[PDB]
Paper text:
As a first step towards the complete structural characterisation of the Emb Araf-transferases in M. tuberculosis, we have determined the crystal structure of the hydrophilic C-terminal domain of EmbC, the enzyme responsible for arabinan chain elongation in LAM synthesis and a target for the front line antibiotic EMB. The Emb enzymes of M. tuberculosis display a common architecture of 13 transmembrane helices in conjunction with a hydrophilic C-terminal domain, and share the same polyprenyl donor-substrate, β-D-arabinofuranosyl-1-monophosphoryldecaprenol (DPA). We found that the architecture of this domain comprises two subdomains, one of which folds as a lectin- or CBM-like domain, the other one shows weak similarity to the C-terminal hydrophilic domain of an unrelated GT-C glycosyltransferase, oligosaccharyl transferase STT3. The presence of a CBM-like subdomain in EmbCCT is consistent the proposed role of the C-terminal domain in acceptor substrate recognition.
Numbering used by the authors:
A (entry chain A), B (entry chain A): 735 to 794, 825 to 1015, 1035 to 1067
Amino acid sequence: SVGRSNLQALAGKTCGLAEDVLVELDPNAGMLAPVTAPLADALGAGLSEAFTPNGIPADVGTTAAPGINGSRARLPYNLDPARTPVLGSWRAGVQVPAMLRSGWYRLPTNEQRDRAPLLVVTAAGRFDSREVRLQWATDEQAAAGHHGGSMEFADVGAAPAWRNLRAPLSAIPSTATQVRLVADDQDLAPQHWIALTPPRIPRVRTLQNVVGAADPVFLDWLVGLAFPCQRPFGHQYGVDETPKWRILPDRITELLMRATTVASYLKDDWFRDWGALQRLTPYY
Amino acid sequence: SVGRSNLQALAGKTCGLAEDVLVELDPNAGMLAPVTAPLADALGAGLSEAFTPNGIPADVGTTAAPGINGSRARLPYNLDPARTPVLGSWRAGVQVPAMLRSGWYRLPTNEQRDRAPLLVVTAAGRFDSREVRLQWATDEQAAAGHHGGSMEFADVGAAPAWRNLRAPLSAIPSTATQVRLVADDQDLAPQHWIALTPPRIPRVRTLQNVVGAADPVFLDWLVGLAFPCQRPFGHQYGVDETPKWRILPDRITELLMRATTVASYLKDDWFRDWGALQRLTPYY
Ligand SMILES: CCCCCCCCO[C@H]1O[C@H](CO)[C@@H](O)[C@@H]1O
Ligand SMILES: CCCCCCCCO[C@H]1O[C@H](CO)[C@@H](O)[C@@H]1O
Ligand SMILES: [Ca+2]
Ligand SMILES: [Ca+2]
């Protein structure tokens, strides 16, 4: 019944699943502005206890030059290190309690058509949903150091790798004007740690609009059934060209390409790990 | 256009792709009877030059007890070693020219409904399509040591791993009564070698008939779209059960199970590597 409706829904769309996957090519464009603190400072401006810019294992790799707040952690989803502070509670050796409270970030008032209805935080590590929360506040509450309420995130994707935590904007009261992140890592097992980046509201376009019908896409035959309008990379008729994307199921390779997963969300279920879209670029 | 028709075709089937994947659970049931030689002897009864039962790398692993002709190579697709001779041209150290000509095998005269229209050989290694051929003959030709003609196989699947070579039965003349395998491995590069097992005509049932709608199946959400009638393994409503199958795209994991790929073929394109069906059993 569910299976049957899913498939009927799929076939009823001109370009199948490509119309339902929403792609966020520029996660930095959606970042919330800090209320008072400079961008570099805002992520840890409230409190940081044993959360540091390099508190993340090399293997969740590492960049030569540090990002804005000193992190050499390689960031996912084409997050720009020069515009993306990172704080994490991982460390080698002696494990200690760790906590984070960011400064306040401003929620949008200016409407934008191309936004997903989600507050998103790119995060890594292993943690329970209660350990990372989004607090909200009015101007008055924030000024007095209080918050009006809080929510948890849906943790979507495989841990401890980088992934996008999602919180439906619908849960945030309409009078809230500011939000902040709070994290609590009291679990001293070495494998239990948290890394966060600042909050954003994704600006998105459909995968069909982003990928189109001309860019060649690496994908399994099975997976391609759901993406009828995408051009499958192959060599029929002696075709020779450069693949530009790869689509993967949720759970290189001919030509030495770098594959970068781009942030994406399924319109039909914002908490579903649908699979992955990756942009391919010459490894050079 | 192709994409669109594929997807419309998919959705038009009650159980989607499950009706088009044909599964061969018992490859030994389809094995051709040798004309004159005992089963153990027939695979190398004509000529074997540097083709041996253990001429296959451990990593294409290995079994404790040898199979019928002395091979400790672990066989794929639930081939029964006690009924499946193997001969291969791989070796360490000094590389030598290698050739194989099997004895004659009898083509069926008794009709069977559940057969795929293919002559199949399970093979491993790296080789060109010209290096492995199927020869056919009438009784008269075979008796005189001649053959009436020959064909190549479609090599479907990733090399050098085990896979199923396929030759359409339609290509074999109606007067042919016997077939044999011939292989030529003159390439002395160590990575270039061939391993073969005897010819068969697969007995098959649809994946829908084999897997059904009750056995839980491990599969990616994306892949499941094409298999609407299969029960996806998960824990919704606190469901606790043992997964029995896994379906994979063409290009563990929660509970310590052994995964065994079963032989399968896509009815719509016998040369397409559609993906894989695996049977799961307790690793114990
Ligand atoms: C079983 C149908 C075989 C048709 C011939 C090759 C079909 C290729 O099929 C692939 O390409 C399509 C996208 O255009 C997509 O539906 C599928 O993954
Ligand atoms: C976007 C639709 C979300 C519906 C709620 C969960 C859907 C689960 O979807 C999975 O199960 C189906 C097989 O029954 C198959 O179509 C799909 O892979
Ligand atoms: Ca910890
Ligand atoms: Ca060789």
